[PDB]
Amino acid sequence: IETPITANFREGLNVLQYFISTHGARKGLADTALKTANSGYLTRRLVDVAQDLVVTEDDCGTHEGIMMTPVIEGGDVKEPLRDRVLGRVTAEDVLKPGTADILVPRNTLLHEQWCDLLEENSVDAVKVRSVVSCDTDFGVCAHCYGRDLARGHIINKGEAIGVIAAQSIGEPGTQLTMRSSIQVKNKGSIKLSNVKSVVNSSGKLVITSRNTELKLIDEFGRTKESYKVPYGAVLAKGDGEQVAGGETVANWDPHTMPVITEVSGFVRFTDMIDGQTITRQTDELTGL
């Protein structure tokens, strides 16, 4: 509503302002009612799909795990490496960039001292053993799960983790809701990923790919900015270079799909017959 409520609860509220407040309040109450109605059924389906998975061995004996990197939406780093690789057994043994020097062995539970020693050396991506890549027939081994959450040590042989997992996912379901360019902030080296780029006549670096992802590598190894770069975007910089803060390095058109080229030559028409393939539509009020 374009005319806001200019009155607080210490002063009065007249009749219309209190009526608009009632719109908001009853919308919230009906949200909470039907929200609980969906949340309980979500907890039911999750504890009935898990239901059975018991920590039934002590070492599966594989290596392939998932790669834990800090998540980067394109602003501040939302979830760091300490809060993701806290207490989970490493897949491949992490070597510090003093290559052929082992920092952690390949079956070490990463508790808080090890996580601080990960944060000091600025470790890129601690590849770690996940439950989904296990090898235990009819159950899940103990090392691929991790720390016993709610306790300190490794998981005991036996605790039913499917049920505590399904309750931990469905329990905050009561709290949930129901119904142009690239601007940099920090400073560091510039990384490009999955790019097919070429040089324009202006001297810049233009792109011939939709799958281009720009990254900002910081001073110690990790990444603090990531940007999906569109098709045919124009960079003011290149790969491996150095920028400063507040410097927009890319620009494109979100309305137009550019069909930019690679080689320099004349333009001709092939299989373009007028009247059928191309039509004659004169732009009336502009001219071109």
Partner 1 sequence: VPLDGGRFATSDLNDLYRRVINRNNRLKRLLDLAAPDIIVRNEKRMLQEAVDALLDNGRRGRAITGSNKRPLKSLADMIKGKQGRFRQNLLGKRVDYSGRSVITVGPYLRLHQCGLPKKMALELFKPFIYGKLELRGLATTIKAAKKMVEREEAVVWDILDEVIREHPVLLNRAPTLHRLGIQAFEPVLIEGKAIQLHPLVCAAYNADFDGDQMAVHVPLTLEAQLEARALMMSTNNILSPANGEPIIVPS
Partner 2 sequence: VYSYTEKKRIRKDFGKRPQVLDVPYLLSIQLDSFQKFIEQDPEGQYGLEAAFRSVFPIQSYSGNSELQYVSYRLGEPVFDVQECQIRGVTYSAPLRVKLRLVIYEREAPEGTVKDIKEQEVYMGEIPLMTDNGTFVINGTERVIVSQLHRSPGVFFDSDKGKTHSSGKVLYNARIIPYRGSWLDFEFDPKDNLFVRIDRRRKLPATIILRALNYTTEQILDLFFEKVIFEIRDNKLQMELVPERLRGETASFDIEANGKVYVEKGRRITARHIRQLEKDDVKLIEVPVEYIAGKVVAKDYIDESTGELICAANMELSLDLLAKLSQSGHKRIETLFTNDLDHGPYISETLRVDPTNDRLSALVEIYRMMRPGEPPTREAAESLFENLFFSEDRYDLSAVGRMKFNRSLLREEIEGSGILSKDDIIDVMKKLIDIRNGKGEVDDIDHLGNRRIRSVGEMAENQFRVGLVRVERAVKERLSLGDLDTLMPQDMINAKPISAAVKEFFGSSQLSQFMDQNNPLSEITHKRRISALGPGGLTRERAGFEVRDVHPTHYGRVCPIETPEGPNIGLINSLSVYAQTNEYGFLETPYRKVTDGVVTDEIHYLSAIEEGNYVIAQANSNLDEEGHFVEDLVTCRSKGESSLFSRDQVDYMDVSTQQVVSVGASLIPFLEHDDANRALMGANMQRQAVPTLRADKPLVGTGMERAVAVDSGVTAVAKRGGVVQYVDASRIVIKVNEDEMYPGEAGIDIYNLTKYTRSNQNTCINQMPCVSLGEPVERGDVLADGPSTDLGELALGQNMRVAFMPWNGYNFEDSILVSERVVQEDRFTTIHIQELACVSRDTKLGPEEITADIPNVGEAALSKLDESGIVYIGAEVTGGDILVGKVTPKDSSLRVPNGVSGTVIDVQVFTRDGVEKDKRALEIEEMQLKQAKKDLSEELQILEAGLFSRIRAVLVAGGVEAEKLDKLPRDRWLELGLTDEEKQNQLEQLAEQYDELKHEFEKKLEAKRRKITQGDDLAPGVLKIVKVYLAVKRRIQPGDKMAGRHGNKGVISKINPIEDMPYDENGTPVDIVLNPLGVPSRMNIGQILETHLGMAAKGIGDKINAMLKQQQEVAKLREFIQRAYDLGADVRQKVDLSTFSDEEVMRLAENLRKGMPIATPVFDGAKEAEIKELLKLGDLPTSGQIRLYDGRTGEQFERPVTVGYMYMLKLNHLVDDKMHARSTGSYSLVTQQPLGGKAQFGGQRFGEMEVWALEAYGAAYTLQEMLTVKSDDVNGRTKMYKNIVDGNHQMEPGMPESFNVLLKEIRSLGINIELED
Partner 3 sequence: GITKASLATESFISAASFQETTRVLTEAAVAGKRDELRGLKENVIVGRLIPAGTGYAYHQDRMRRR
Show Cβ contacts of residue 80 under 8 Å, excluding neighbours closer than 6 positions.
70
Residue 80 interface partner, choices partner 1, DNA, partner 3, none, CB cut-off 5-8 Å depending on type:
none
Contact 136, 57 (CB under 8 A): yes
- Nearest approach, Cβ of residue 53 and partner 3 (Å): 8
Among 31, 48, 59, 83, binds partner 3 (CB under 8 A): 48
DSSP H or E run through 181? strand 181-182
SS3 per-residue string spanning 200-265: CCCCCEEECCCCEEEEEECCCCCEEEEEEECCCCEECCCCCCECCCCCCCEECCCCCCCCCCCCCC
Residues 41-80 that bind partner 1 (CB under 8 A): 43
* Structural tokens at position 73: 């939406």
Residue 41 site contact among partner 2, partner 1, DNA, none (CB < 5 to 8 Å, cut-off depends on kind): DNA
The CA-atom distances, in angstroms, between 225 and each of 63, 71, 73, 86 are 30, 10, 8, 23
Q: Does residue 30 belong to the site contacting partner 2 (CB under 8 A)? A: yes
Residues 32-61 that bind DNA (CB under 7 A): 33, 36-37, 40-41, 44
Among 25, 49, 67, 71, binds partner 2 (CB under 8 A): 25
The least distance separating DNA from the CB of residue 19, rounded to whole angstroms, comes to 21
Q: Which range binds partner 1 by CB under 8 A, 71-79, 143-151, 180-188, 210-218?
A: 143-151
Provide the pairing of β-strand 234-235 with 205-207: antiparallel
Binding window for partner 1 (CB under 8 A); candidates: 64-72, 163-171, 176-184, 242-250: 163-171
Q: Write the DSSP symbol of residue 96.
A: P
Question: What's the sign of the alpha-carbon dihedral 15, 18, 22, 24?
Answer: positive
Is 285 an interacting residue with respect to partner 2 (CB under 8 A)?
no
Q: Which is nearer to Zn ion, 43 or 133 (CB)?
A: 133
Among residues 164, 195, 236, 243, the one that binds partner 2 under rule CB under 8 A: 164
Kindly state the greatest CA–CA separation across the chain.
79
Backbone φ and ψ for 23, nearest 5 degrees, come out as -50, -55
CB of 89 to Zn ion, least distance (A): 9
Among 4, 10, 201, 279, binds partner 2 (CB under 8 A): 10
Per CB under 8 A, residues contacting partner 1 are 43, 86, 149-151, 163-164, 167-168, 170-172, 174
